Amino acid sequence: YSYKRWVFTINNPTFEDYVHVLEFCTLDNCKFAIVGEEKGANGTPHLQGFLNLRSNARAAALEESLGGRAWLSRARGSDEDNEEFCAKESTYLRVGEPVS
DNA sequence: ATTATTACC
């Protein structure tokens, strides 16, 4: 039950949430990663992203890697589907290139 | 696992 391709959301992200995302979402760990940040007026601020990991991870392990407050789900769309969705966010961090 | 109603297809 360990997988490479995941989506995640971190609602009301904390300092440590950002620190975990910044250290983990790197080319060392990911073939491709994209993480958007939205914190506008009438909604809960979030980090929201997609990870195509180099190594399989069990959900409990990825949860720890992302700071322990993340919602996780096995990715259902393609890397490019996720790139297009997350790149709509007003700020985003993009690591690597989508795999097809 | 986990905070939320946001979350790819």
Residue numbers in the entry: 7 to 106
From the primary publication:
Precleavage complexes were obtained using the dDCV mutant. The substrate in both structures conforms to the characteristic “U”-shaped architecture, indicating that the ssDNA conformation is largely facilitated by the DNA binding interface and intramolecular base pairing and base stacking, with little support from the coordinated cation. Indeed, Lys94 is positioned away from the active site in the absence of Mn2+ coordination. In the absence of Mn2+, the measured distance is 3.0 Å, whereas when Mn2+ is coordinated in the active site, and the scissile phosphate is pulled 0.7 Å closer to the oxygen, with a measured distance of 2.3 Å. The bound ssDNA retains its stabilizing intramolecular WC base pair and base stacking regardless of ion coordination. This suggests that while the ion does play an important role in both substrate polarization and positioning, it has little impact on its conformation, which is largely enforced by the nucleic acid’s intramolecular interactions and contacts with the Rep’s sDBM.
Replication-initiating HUH endonucleases (Reps) are sequence-specific nucleases that cleave and rejoin single-stranded DNA (ssDNA) during rolling-circle replication. Replication initiator proteins (Reps) from this HUH endonuclease superfamily are found in a variety of bacterial plasmids and viral genomes, including circular Rep-encoding single-stranded DNA (CRESS-DNA) viruses that are known to infect organisms across all three domains of life (1–5). These enzymes initiate rolling-circle replication through sequence-specific processing of the viral single-stranded DNA (ssDNA) genome via cleavage and subsequent phosphotyrosine covalent linkage to the ssDNA’s newly exposed 5′ end. Following linkage, the genome’s freed 3′-OH can be used as a primer for DNA replication before its ultimate return to the active site, where it attacks the phosphotyrosine intermediate to rejoin and release the circular ssDNA genome.
